[PDB]
Amino acid sequence: ALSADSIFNIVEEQTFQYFWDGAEPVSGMARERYHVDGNYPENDMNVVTSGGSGFGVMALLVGIERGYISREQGLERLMKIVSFLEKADRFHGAWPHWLYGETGKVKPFGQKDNGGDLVETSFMIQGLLCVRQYFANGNEQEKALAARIDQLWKAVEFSWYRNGKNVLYWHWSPNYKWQMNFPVTGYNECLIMYILAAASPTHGIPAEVYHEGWAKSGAIKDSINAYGHTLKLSHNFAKEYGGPLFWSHYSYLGLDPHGLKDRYADYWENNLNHVLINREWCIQNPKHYKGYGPDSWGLTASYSVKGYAAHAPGENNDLGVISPTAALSSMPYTPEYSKQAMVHWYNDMRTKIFGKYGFYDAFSETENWYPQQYLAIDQGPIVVMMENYRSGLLWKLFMSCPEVQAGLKKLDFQSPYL
Ligand SMILES: OC[C@H]1O[C@@H](O[C@H]2[C@H](O[C@@H]3[C@@H](O)[C@H](O)[C@@H](CO)O[C@H]3O)O[C@H](CO)[C@@H](O)[C@@H]2O)[C@H](O)[C@@H](O)[C@@H]1O
Ligand SMILES: OC[C@H]1O[C@@H](O)[C@H](O)[C@@H](O)[C@@H]1O
Ligand SMILES: [K+]
Known part of the structure; x- marks a missing residue:
């Protein structure tokens, strides 16, 4: 029976290994998935994911900082990644969701999603900007990396994805044009795309794209009340409890939500309340699933008993599946509650739910379902948020970008970093 502190470092280190020992070997990029038993129904073990690899380059910086890998080891890996990303398919400067690791060519995420994915590109840019800042004051080779990242950053054409409108579209294709129509x-989960779009010095958006598009001219304001907690953001399709919990993770890995506010919301309090509602649902456990309680909580999108599902609170959304990234990546918001789950899982369940790349993606005690499987997009925010809770690493780096601060000012945000 180990201490939280011992468990914390074991979990952080092993989760980081998804992105190191687990990386696709040619590219260095994060695999979409890793299945311990070697069975890949889609034969896609070496398909890498642009968004999750954004998480992973952050994780590499955690690795250098915690001594998991040397500074030099980290640098050479990031160099390899950036080389790959410089030759990979880009679609008005945005990467696709999926790439073949060995070649950098697109794998369509469904037939018509065969071009750019601006949302996944934004998670890659959030992470690559942290790398730019981390290296900006190092040696000749570190600065040339920082510059090549700056170049990739500046070539993302956020404005292209307006398609002439005051909003950003998720996708664009060479042949299917705007047919994905999102x-x-x-x-x-997508706030960071609009922030980066405003920040871009070469291909930015005017403020109306954010206010009329993302914010729906104010219709983003809502009042979702559950368990005595209010969300003031209109969570899409989730007006009872808020969405899957990762919405309070992905856009907040670099962007620091502490003290972040604009006319639509206080992001700290809304992210926190999102977590506390999620946890409370699991404690009340209305569907009477096995294992739900204060030592085992957190619903988010992940693998599921019948495949993949966007788990969340509500009788229609909670499938008896707990996915560790929900509670663990919530560490900066709810450290003691996130540690409570982490400790129970490690001390009491590790032989079922803990593996070489950290805790597995999802489980159901109701169904005795304990797949030895992992997803980049679930492991990445665990490593990153655990390190943010510890030291602020990625927040410090990201928030230091002059362009991030300008973009936040342009969209009428408040934050101490400004
Ligand atoms: O396939 C498009 C895009 O979907 C992203 O999911 C969004 C989800 O989008 C769904 C869409 O996928 C679904 O087919 C239709 C009808 O069922 O409705 C939309 O809601 O919406 C939520 C709420 O805005 C998002 O959190 C979620 O991420 C995928 O993430 C993305 O990878 C994919 O390209
Ligand atoms: O990217 C995360 C997951 O999204 C799901 O919709 C897809 O079916 C999976 O291939 C993928 O692992
Ligand atoms: K197979």
Whole structure:
């Protein structure tokens, strides 16, 4: 029976290994998935994911900082990644969701999603900007990396994805054009795309794209009340309890939500309340699933008993599946509650739910379902948020970008970093 502190470092280190020992070997990029038993129904073990690899380059910086790898080891790996990303398919400067690791060519995420994915590109840029800042004051080779990252950053054509409108579209294809037809309106996980779009010095957006598009001219404001907690953001399709918990993770890995506010919300309090509602649902456990309680909580999108599902509170959304990234990546918001789950899982369940790349993606005690499987997009925010809770690493780096601060000012945000 180990201490939280011992467990914390074991979990952080092993989770980081998804992105190191687990990386696709040619590219260095994060695999979409890793299945311990070697069985890949889609034969896609070496398909890498642009968004999750953004998480992973952050994780590499955690690795250098915690001594998991040397500074030099980290640098050479990031160099390899950036080389790959310089030759990979880009679609008005945005990477696709999926790439073949060995070649850097697109794998369509469904037939018509065969071009750019601006949302996944934004998670890659959040992470690559942290790397730019980390190296900006090092040696000749570190600065040339920082510059090549700056170049990739500046070539993302955020404005292209407006398609002439006051909003950003998620996708664009060479041949299918705008047929995916997903204009990105809030609230969902995608805030960082609009912030980066405003920040871009070469291909930015005017403020109306954010206010009329993301914010729906104010219709993003809501009042979702559960367990005595209020969300003031209109969580898309989740007006009872808020969405899957990762919405309070992905856009907040670099962007620091502490003290972040604008006319639509106080992001700290809304992110926190999102977590506390999620946890409370698991404590009340209305569907009477096995294992739900204060030592085992957190619903988010992940592998599921019948495949993959966007788990969340509500009788229609909670499938008896707990996914560790929900509670663990919530460490900066709810450290003691996130540690409570982490400790129970490690001390009492590790032989079922803990593996070489940290805790597995999802489990159901109701169904005795304990797949030895992992997803980049679930492991990455665990490593990153655990380190943010510890030291602020990625927040410090990201928030230091002059362009991030300008973009936040342009969109009428408040934050101490400004
Ligand atoms: O396939 C498009 C895009 O979907 C992203 O999911 C969004 C989800 O989008 C769903 C869409 O996928 C679904 O087919 C239709 C009808 O069922 O409705 C939309 O809501 O919406 C939520 C709420 O805004 C987002 O959190 C979620 O991420 C995938 O993430 C993305 O990878 C994919 O390209
Ligand atoms: O990217 C995360 C997951 O999204 C799901 O919709 C897809 O079916 C999976 O291939 C993928 O692992
Ligand atoms: K197979």
